[PDB]
Amino acid sequence: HTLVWGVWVNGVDQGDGRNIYIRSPPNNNPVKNLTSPDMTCNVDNRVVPKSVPVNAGDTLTFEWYHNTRDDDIIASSHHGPIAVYIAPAASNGQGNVWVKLFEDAYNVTNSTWAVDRLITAHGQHSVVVPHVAPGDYLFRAEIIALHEADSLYSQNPIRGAQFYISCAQITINSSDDSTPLPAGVPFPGAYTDSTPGIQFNIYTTPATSYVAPPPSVWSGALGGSIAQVGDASLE
Ligand SMILES: OC[C@H]1O[C@@H](O[C@H]2[C@H](O)[C@@H](O)[C@H](O[C@H]3[C@H](O)[C@@H](O)[C@H](O[C@H]4[C@H](O)[C@@H](O)[C@H](O[C@H]5[C@H](O)[C@@H](O)[C@H](O[C@H]6[C@H](O)[C@@H](O)[C@H](O)O[C@@H]6CO)O[C@@H]5CO)O[C@@H]4CO)O[C@@H]3CO)O[C@@H]2CO)[C@H](O)[C@@H](O)[C@@H]1O
Numbered sequence: 001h002t003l004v005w006g007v008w009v010n011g012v013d014q015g016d017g018r019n020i021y022i023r024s025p026p027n028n029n030p031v032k033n034l035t036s037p038d039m040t041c042n043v044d045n046r047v048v049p050k051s052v053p054v055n056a057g058d059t060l061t062f063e064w065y066h067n068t069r070d071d072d073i074i075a076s077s078h079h080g081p082i083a084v085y086i087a088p089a090a091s092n093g094q095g096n097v098w099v100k101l102f103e104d105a106y107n108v109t110n111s112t113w114a115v116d117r118l119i120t121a122h123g124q125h126s127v128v129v130p131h132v133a134p135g136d137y138l139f140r141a142e143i144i145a146l147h148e149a150d151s152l153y154s155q156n157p158i159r160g161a162q163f164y165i166s167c168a169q170i171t172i173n174s175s176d177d178s179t180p181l182p183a184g185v186p187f188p189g190a191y192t193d194s195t196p197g198i199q200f201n202i203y204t205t206p207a208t209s210y211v212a213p214p215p216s217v218w219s220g221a222l223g224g225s226i227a228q229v230g231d232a233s234l235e
């Protein structure tokens with residue numbers, strides 16, 4: 001149970017984005033139904049009045065929280081991967097439009113899931129803005145919590161992988177458009193009951209055998225990390 005509070009750009013807090021530049025749902029409940037339109041940008045997908053301006057090569061940091069800003073972020077039980085996708089805003093997230101910019105699942109050195117790392121990062125994880133066409137975009141940050149993913153929602157609707165999905169409205173201003181955005185996958189559609197990483201038992205299967213759901217990260221993606229970039233108590 002987690003939500004995005006706002007974003008930072010190059011380590012500068014853009015301010016509370018809830019219902020402003022984030023297409024915020026009304027609460028932190030998960031999405032579980034893989035075929036639902038809620039998979040696109042959660043349960044209240046609509047245009048919100050602001051977009052955050054960035055330039056290619058900028059660091060865009062999502063900041064998540066549980067109840068209040070910079071709290072415990074998400075329950076530590078919610079082990080799982082984190083991804084970020086991008087689509088053009090003109091799509092409204094419909095169609096084969098979602099391109100993966102970032103994936104982190106299980107880190108064998110530190111023996112930590114992405115979610116664990118996110119808590120340590122005070123809710124912050126980033127992507128570097130790619131060299132796509134200037135214009136308006138949706139960045140879709142997705143946390144998958146696997147604590148009840150040994151069942152499939154489609155078979156048992158009280159269990160299933162949980163998706164915490166947040167779409168940010170981002171305007172890319174300066175960019176030379178040298179890596180124009182390739183085709184995308186659909187949400188809903190990309191994840192199905194047979195997709196690797198959707199049904200998994202994190203209690204009896206070693207985490208090293210976990211494979212996150214495709215698609216793979218776009219070759220044109222410029223990187224990203226789960227790491228604190230700014231201190232919410234000060235700015
Ligand atoms: O040798 C070890 C053996 O381990 C076995 O594996 C076991 C393992 O031992 C055990 O840890 C595991 O137990 C998990 C359960 O299966 C799973 O269902 C459970 O789900 C919890 C979850 O931990 C918890 O975080 C979650 O809390 C929700 C809550 O439901 C929700 O209502 C609340 O909502 C509020 C919002 O948070 C709040 O912001 C808002 O204001 O109000 C909302 C409404 O009040 O949100 C919280 C999260 O914040 O609830 C679920 C239960 O619903 O997680 C357990 C793990 O902690 O089971 C494993 C299998 O039994 C191996 O199988 C064996 O081989 C090994 O030998």
Ligand SMILES: *[C@@H]1O[C@H](CO)[C@@H](O)[C@H](O)[C@H]1NC(C)=O
Nearest residue numbers: 033034035036037038153157
């Ligand atoms: C899952 O979503 C699909 C598409 O909206 C819908 O038909 C189906 O009824 C949903 N499943 C449940 C259990 O609500």
Ligand SMILES: [Cl-]
Nearest residue numbers: 001030147162
């Ligand atoms: Cl839960």
Ligand SMILES: [Cl-]
Nearest residue numbers: 014015016017
């Ligand atoms: Cl603010």
Ligand SMILES: [Cl-]
Nearest residue numbers: 030031032033
């Ligand atoms: Cl759902």
Ligand SMILES: [Cl-]
Nearest residue numbers: 065067068069
């Ligand atoms: Cl708050």
Ligand SMILES: [Cl-]
Nearest residue numbers: 120121227228
């Ligand atoms: Cl950190």
Ligand SMILES: [Cl-]
Nearest residue numbers: 056131175176
């Ligand atoms: Cl550029």
Ligand SMILES: [Cl-]
Nearest residue numbers: 034035188189
């Ligand atoms: Cl579907």
Ligand SMILES: [Cu+2]
Nearest residue numbers: 001002075078
């Ligand atoms: Cu939860």
